[PDB]
Curated annotation (Swiss-Prot), chains A, B:
Disruption phenotype: Abolishes recruitment of the mediator complex to the upstream activating sequence (UAS) of amino-acid starvation responsive genes. Decreases RNA level of genes involved in amino acid biosynthesis and cofactor biosynthesis during amino acid starvation or methyl methanesulfonate stress. Growth dependent on amino acid supplementation. Sensitive to amino acid starvation. Sensitive to purine starvation. Decreases cellular glycogen levels during glucose starvation. It comes from Saccharomyces cerevisiae (strain ATCC 204508 / S288c) (Baker's yeast). Induction: Translation is induced by amino acid or purine starvation, or during growth in low or poor carbon sources. Translational repression during nutrient-rich conditions is dependent on four uORFs (upstream open reading frames) present in the 5'-UTR of the mRNA; these promote ribosome dissociation. Translational induction occurs in conditions reducing translation machinery efficiency, leading to ribosomes scanning over the uORFs, and increased translation of the mRNA. The rapid translational induction is followed by transcriptional induction at later time-points, independently of the uORF sequences. Master transcriptional regulator that mediates the response to amino acid starvation. Binds variations of the DNA sequence 5'-ATGA[CG]TCAT-3' in canonical nucleosome-depleted 5'-positioned promoters, and also within coding sequences and 3' non-coding regions. During nutrient starvation (low or poor amino acid, carbon or purine sources), it activates genes required for amino acid biosynthesis and transport, autophagy, cofactor biosynthesis and transport, mitochondrial transport, and additional downstream transcription factors. This is General control transcription factor GCN4. Residues 89 to 100 and 106 to 125 define the N-terminal activation domain (NTAD) and the central acidic activation domain (CAAD) respectively, which can function independently to promote high-level transcription of the target genes. Belongs to the bZIP family. GCN4 subfamily. It is found in: Nucleus. Phosphorylated by the cyclin-CDK PCL5-PHO85.
Length: 38, 38
C-alpha cells in the first residue's frame, strides 16, 4: 500500500538512465573537448 | 513493478541518474547551442 516503487521499472530506468548518464557525460565532455573554442 | 530490495538505493540511483540525465541533457544541449563553434 504505502510502499513499492517498481523494481523492474526503476531497474530499467536506472540501467537505461545510467547508460544515458555516461552517454551524455561523455557526449558533453567530448563536446567541450571537441569545441574548446576561444 | 514489485520487488522490495534496495528500492531506496535503486530509487536514489534512478532519481539521481534522472536528474543527471536532464542536467546533462539541458547542459549539453545548451552547450552545443552555446559552443556553436566551427
Amino acid at each position: 500500500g504505502a510502499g513499492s516503487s517498481s523494481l523492474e521499472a526503476v531497474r530499467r530506468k536506472i540501467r537505461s538512465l545510467q547508460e544515458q548518464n555516461y552517454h551524455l557525460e561523455n557526449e558533453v565532455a567530448r563536446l567541450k573537448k571537441l569545441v574548446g573554442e576561444r
